[PDB]
RNA sequence: UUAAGUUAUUAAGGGCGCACGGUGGAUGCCUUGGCACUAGAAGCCGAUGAAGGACGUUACUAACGACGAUAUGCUUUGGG
RNA sequence: ACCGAUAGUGAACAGUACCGUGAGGGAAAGGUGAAAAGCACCCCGGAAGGGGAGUGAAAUAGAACCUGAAACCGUGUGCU
RNA sequence: UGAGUAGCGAAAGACGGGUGAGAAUCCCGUCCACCGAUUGACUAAGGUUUCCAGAGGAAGGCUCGUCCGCUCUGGGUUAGU
RNA sequence: AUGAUGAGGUUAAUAGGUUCGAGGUGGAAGCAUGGUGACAUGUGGAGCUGACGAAUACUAAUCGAUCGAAGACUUAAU
């Protein structure tokens, strides 16, 4: 079948998380863990914590074989932003966006 | 040679503080580019130890700091005596080398390539 | 000094076609463990 | 560079504050206008 | 086999259409609050210390209401 | 034959947050469900979040809780 | 949108050990460096709990954060001169 | 600038070190002697030396992984 796991309101901005997220889609799960431990972006241990959760759902809730699974989907949606300010010069301020993300990966065994 | 992002007087001080603690502890952990430079400094300092006369004892004291080692069995020796006492014994047959560099991954706060340099 | 027109969605997306990232080296720890980085030392989850 | 509003505790209570408003007729007018808006702090 | 000629195949990325999601809070439905008026009473208290406020009061207490060292209320007469 | 939350009182939750030395100026912010029955228990995780299970007529009704448009951000794809 | 662009607010750090899911950035130690008619020590205005202990890591901190002038709980100012 | 370019990757002199040189500086430390002493002389063209030259596997360039063709049709000579 398919299993999934999402992580909602992650403080990293969505453009920054989609870079590392493009390396792992379409690949099987053993390679995808090895990639996320060796890229030094800040997003990498957050995605890797999510992919662990989706593998554990397939073993427990659905009784799949974890040795042969592939990543079907991996994507990141926007969450709500936090609006801050920063004082610039001559009494003027500027706006700063603290972005958030919802991360979703699904995993499957390719059969019906 | 490299500049290491420091001024001329700061680079000299950082490079002989770094070479002293490699004599004390015999393997330390630092960045890649700093370990490439202390490679040649500490091996020119073992060459002074293998000669062993007074005039090179005076010349190695230009570089090392004044650090006491709490040696085992409650004895205590300086860092200069430990260079002419033990390291000069182990490398009396070898003709260079004396050090090696082993790479590791980046640190978290930077992308700085960590490196262990050891004394062989 | 300031942009005269906005940039459309296509021209923005054609610009960041090289704004990518590459896969790392990924050798193996042959003695015991998972994959390590090439020319590095398999310290954790590794024996090489 | 020195700014305006160098604060002082005696002076603020003496050009403003309750007893100074009560001592004139026009000071009593401003207490009546702030009771009519329902302003929480008077003087 | 050689010459001359014609025509294919790629999509790093982009465009159109379709499907599925997210953010965001329009629209619809609603009302706890308001606006304008009618009829009938009544219009302004105070040195016997006012209007308006400050401090406090609940077993556990931050704000609002009520109350005042008899303090999150007391007595009596009638309802229930 | 007045308004229905950008309306109608500035104010449906305030002359308060806030600004000003001061007179003074002055906001924003409504809606789970019939009933709280408001997710026992298991699994990943340091937690936050989530997948199952269960309540319920309905949980893409889970408290940032009716309906959920558009801008905008993404993932797949048929023709190019 | 500009755009992963400008900027991240004068200055010298290095190593070891520890704690922790996690450490350039927290604690301990050694060396090094800066001020020193002052980056030292007192007292006034002014501000009003920012003081101390223990616990914490959503927001704040121009990075990180196991830390904090931040959050929670509880404590603390004593005069005949 | 980055990237590209070029020299090399153990069947190896790519870099570092070690040894020997070039060139630069100009007579080390210690000891002895003379001098009241400041100092001078000898040991000794000494000692020190970044980038330059040659030799030497002492240290490190490990193990590995990825991409990459399978000669279309028509006609005329052969
Ligand atoms: Mg964060
Ligand atoms: Mg200013
Ligand atoms: Mg100087
Ligand atoms: Mg793109
Ligand atoms: Mg593509
Ligand atoms: Mg009357
Ligand atoms: Mg009764
Ligand atoms: Mg209104
Ligand atoms: Mg509405
Ligand atoms: Mg004020
Ligand atoms: Mg309003
Ligand atoms: Mg939970
Ligand atoms: Mg629905
Ligand atoms: Mg919403
Ligand atoms: Mg309804
Ligand atoms: Mg809704
Ligand atoms: Mg860039
Ligand atoms: Mg530009
Ligand atoms: Mg630029
Ligand atoms: Mg910059
Ligand atoms: Mg700074
Ligand atoms: Mg440390
Ligand atoms: Mg310290
Ligand atoms: Mg000084
Ligand atoms: Mg001070
Ligand atoms: Mg005071
Ligand atoms: Mg404190
Ligand atoms: Mg503490
Ligand atoms: Mg934090
Ligand atoms: Mg932060
Ligand atoms: Mg902890
Ligand atoms: Mg505090």
Curated annotation (Swiss-Prot), chain A:
One BP term from GO: translation
SUPFAM superfamilies named in the record: Ribosomal protein L22
Annotated Gene Ontology cellular component terms: cytosolic large ribosomal subunit
Keywords: Ribonucleoprotein, Ribosomal protein, RNA-binding, rRNA-binding
Organism superkingdom: Bacteria
MF terms (GO), sorted A to Z: rRNA binding; structural constituent of ribosome
One Pfam family in the UniProt entry: Ribosomal_L22
InterPro entries linked: Ribosomal_uL22 (IPR001063), Ribosomal_uL22_bac/chlpt-type (IPR005727), Ribosomal_uL22_bac/org-type (IPR047867), Ribosomal_uL22_CS (IPR018260), Ribosomal_uL22_sf (IPR036394)
Assembly, per entry: Part of the 50S ribosomal subunit.
Function: This protein binds specifically to 23S rRNA; its binding is stimulated by other ribosomal proteins, e.g. L4, L17, and L20. It is important during the early stages of 50S assembly. It makes multiple contacts with different domains of the 23S rRNA in the assembled 50S subunit and ribosome. The globular domain of the protein is located near the polypeptide exit tunnel on the outside of the subunit, while an extended beta-hairpin is found that lines the wall of the exit tunnel in the center of the 70S ribosome.
Family from the record: Belongs to the universal ribosomal protein uL22 family.
Official protein name in the record: Large ribosomal subunit protein uL22
Species the sequence originates in: Staphylococcus aureus (strain bovine RF122 / ET3-1)
Taxonomy of the source species: Bacteria, Bacillati, Bacillota, Bacilli, Bacillales
Gene responsible for this protein: rplV
From Swiss-Prot, chain B:
Record-level GO BP terms: translation
Keywords of the record: Ribonucleoprotein, Ribosomal protein
Xref: Pfam families: Ribosomal_L17
InterPro entries in the cross-refs: Ribosomal_bL17 (IPR000456), Ribosomal_bL17_CS (IPR047859), Ribosomal_bL17_sf (IPR036373)
Secretion signal span: none
UniProt keyword Cell membrane, yes or no: no
Gene Ontology cellular component terms for the protein in this record: cytosolic large ribosomal subunit
GO molecular function per UniProt: structural constituent of ribosome
Domain of life: Bacteria
HAMAP family: Ribosomal_bL17
Assembly behavior: Part of the 50S ribosomal subunit. Contacts protein L32.
Family designation: Belongs to the bacterial ribosomal protein bL17 family.
Protein name: Large ribosomal subunit protein bL17
Species annotation: Staphylococcus aureus (strain bovine RF122 / ET3-1)
UniProtKB/Swiss-Prot annotation, chain D:
Organism placement in taxonomy: Bacteria, Bacillati, Bacillota, Bacilli, Bacillales
Origin superkingdom: Bacteria
Source organism of this protein record: Staphylococcus aureus (strain bovine RF122 / ET3-1)
A Pfam entry, by short name: Ribosomal_L34
Signal peptide start-end: none
Keyword Ribosomal protein listed: yes
UniProt key word Ribosomal protein: yes
GO cellular component, one term: ribosome
Alphabetical list of InterPro entries matching this protein: Ribosomal_bL34 (IPR000271), Ribosomal_bL34_CS (IPR020939)
UniProt name for this protein: Large ribosomal subunit protein bL34
Recorded name of the encoding gene: rpmH
Region described as Disordered: spans on this chain: 1-43
